[PDB]
């Protein structure tokens, strides 16, 4: 989006590949994991994403 | 919440509530969900009867 002349331009859009996101890595048994993923939810959940 | 410790000692999850009473069963149920908050599980099924 930023290529200069856009020449360097990506096939498809991930069709063919993997397509995984991306997350927050939290320690096996860290308390706070609820309370990332309800604010996560809640981001996404009103635009601010 | 020492039974909460039981799950502590023998690493157990899977668990079901069962109250004849009513009134310090709800207040058992209200501690009993805020400890499994903290393992963030729940009980199977709560029963409450006369």
């Given at each position: 989006g930023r290529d200069e002349?856009?020449?360097?331009?990506t096939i498809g859009s991930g069709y063919i590949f993997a397509?995984?996101?991306y997350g927050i890595a939290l320690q096996k048994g860290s308390p706070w994991?609820?309370?990332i993923d309800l604010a996560l939810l809640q981001f996404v959940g009103d635009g601010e994403m | 919440s020492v039974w909460f410790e039981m799950m502590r000692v023998y690493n157990?999850?899977?668990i079901i509530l069962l109250v004849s009473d009513d009134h310090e069963g709800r207040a058992a149920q209200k501690r009993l969900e805020t400890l499994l908050e903290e393992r963030e599980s729940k009980a199977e099924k709560v029963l409450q009867f006369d």
């Open positions: 002349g856009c020449k360097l331009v397509t995984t996101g994991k609820r309370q | 157990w999850n899977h």
